[PDB]
């Protein structure tokens, strides 16, 4: 069935780049996207992550058409990240330049047009860690 | 002296609405405009269920901004279409209508006056000229 | 009670435009595509002759409330300048799908063409792709 | 089996206005388009000062067109902004509002029904299924 | 500025021509091609007389100082292409799929250097060429 295999994460100095890759087994209006989880938010300011706070949805980073003709970017990564697709091989790519400590997160490839909201995603990869130095 | 006084904070359930107000007085500097920033709760970076360490020093995130006339507005994309920023230039007062509130919107909201604001360019907290003292918004899940 | 548009024209795909409507309740921008030869037979016929006047963005008279069609919410921003009694539409990262005639409208948030009370003449917006 | 009856012709001075009407009766015309064509004067293409020979051609050129179902409009560019085509689905009538008339707008104007418009280019007289009898518009200089 | 046209001629319908315009400088701002296919017998008496002899030259195509903006008469769109080589001091009109109705005297036109927009109206022309004949066959 549908399998999404992420590669290309790691540790990188602030200002550096990475290229994430997601190869999609057998499936896909439609498109793919990259989401990221920078961590749960303490929506109570008590010092702990508990209850309703573990439901912080993964945040949209970039998405792309099945055709590749449509793209959308989270506004804090526009101009620094470029999403692209090679339908021919199984793969979608996120070029990430000018990386910031704020970009540290678990990045997740997503497949369903230009998918943007987590609920609107059907299939998820298991995620890959990106940890940028705090410079 | 220029001063910004905020109001309209509230506690509502998810899906509700609020409207924050910021009243500007004194010698507003005419160019640029005003904006709302917010300090939400902090992120469990290393995923240990706690908040500590590098997860403690805080940074205010831009939410919306508006020119003094009101003709140019700009939004953080996670609030676009839910929040509306407006100005009553007469009363030198700026408003943030907040619809379809979400738990993640819980934060201290700070009004700001910034001579360097312009739509389409990110508005930096470090470039703000005057700050309000903040009002609490809490959205229950 | 007139409404006069300004600021349309041709633009590269990915570029930006700012539209203006000056008046003389709330206001809104609608858009209507030109004929599309769907079945690509060289003619315009049947359902291809029907073009919806679609809602894009709307704003209350005070500017305190806005609404957007979901496909344009990320790229269009609507705003109001009272005193000059003028409404703006900032349009960024435009795509060829955005090619259409854009109509400013006013009504005594306005969301549907049947609720419009006054219409501008329209301004052509063309995105190159 | 479309019958088209035109009205509204006249004689006005440059700068004036008229409104042509075309009343439509018959079958399927609401599933297609309607248009106004005009036959301006002959062109003295060899510059001898009169009209003769091949110059006696009544070229009927598209001026304005409309989809009956949705009301989309298209105009010859020399009349855009001055002319407005519209239709009233209750009265089965099409209109051509002509403002800021000019001597060059003098012509016989013909209402036309067509099932299809050409895509990307102007619809031609030979593409019309049914025609009205023609209505004279004369604009003085 | 002085404008001089070239590239006119006599061509079978369906053929092509390229008109060229050389100016003293572009120094010229926006530029355009106009054409006069002939006076129209507006009062239908068979003569040409009176105001009928005043008929303005018709806009065909126009181009910005920089060449980044163009406009066309709708009956030539997709057939004609206007271009500008400010280095070589030349403005061109490629004319494909020519029709008999395209027969006319074609005139190069220019506005002053700082009206850099697209020229679309005769009243907005500052300087005119003397014109070049184009004649397209039927059979
Ligand atoms: Tb907590
Ligand atoms: Tb922690
Ligand atoms: Tb820490
Ligand atoms: Tb954002
Ligand atoms: Tb078709
Ligand atoms: Tb003759
Ligand atoms: Tb024309
Ligand atoms: Tb005569």
């Amino acid at each position: 069935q549908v399998q999404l295999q992420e590669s290309g994460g790691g540790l990188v100095q602030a200002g550096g780049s990475l290229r994430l890759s997601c190869a999609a087994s057998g499936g896909t209006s439609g498109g793919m996207a990259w989401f990221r989880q920078a961590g749960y938010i303490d929506t109570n300011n008590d010092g702990w992550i508990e209850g309703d706070e573990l439901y912080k949805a993964r945040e949209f980073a970039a998405g792309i058409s099945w055709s590749g003709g449509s793209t959308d970017y989270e506004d804090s990564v526009k101009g620094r990240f470029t999403i692209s697709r090679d339908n021919a091989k199984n793969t979608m790519y996120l070029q990430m330049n000018s990386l910031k400590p704020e970009d540290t997160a678990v990045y997740y490839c997503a497949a369903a047009g230009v998918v943007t909201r987590a609920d609107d995603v059907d299939y998820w990869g298991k995620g890959t860690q990106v940890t940028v130095s705090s410079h």
Side-chain angles (χ1 to χ4, degrees), chain A:
Chain A
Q1 69 158 16
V2 179
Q3 273 92 6
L4 315 177
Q5 184 47 36
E6 303 124 336
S7 66
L11 315 185
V12 57
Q13 303 185 311
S17 304
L18 291 168
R19 181 172 85 179
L20 308 183
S21 323
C22 174
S25 268
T28 191
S29 103
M32 298 168 78
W34 281 97
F35 282 72
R36 60 184 175 181
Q37 181 62 263
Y40 304 127
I41 289 289
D42 189 28
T43 326
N44 78 351
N45 195 28
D46 62 1
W48 291 83
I49 291 288
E50 75 293 327
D52 299 288
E53 298 174 344
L54 298 103
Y55 293 177
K56 192 255 154 203
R58 302 150 174 191
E59 195 190 313
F60 177 72
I64 181 163
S65 308
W66 181 77
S67 56
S70 71
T71 60
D72 286 300
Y73 297 93
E74 142 73 10
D75 56 7
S76 76
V77 308
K78 183 73 173 98
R80 305 191 291 117
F81 293 10
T82 303
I83 192 166
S84 73
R85 196 174 181 146
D86 189 301
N87 277 352
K89 319 167 235 202
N90 275 224
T91 325
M92 163 195 56
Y93 306 97
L94 195 61
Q95 182 182 12
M96 298 200 273
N97 291 331
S98 305
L99 278 173
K100 303 164 178 333
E102 310 80 285
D103 295 313
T104 295
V106 179
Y107 284 74
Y108 295 90
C109 168
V114 57
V115 314
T116 169
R117 274 220 181 190
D119 308 352
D120 301 350
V121 166
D122 295 320
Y123 314 100
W124 291 97
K126 290 298 154 299
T128 196
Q129 182 68 40
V130 174
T131 304
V132 178
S133 76
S134 197
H135 216 193

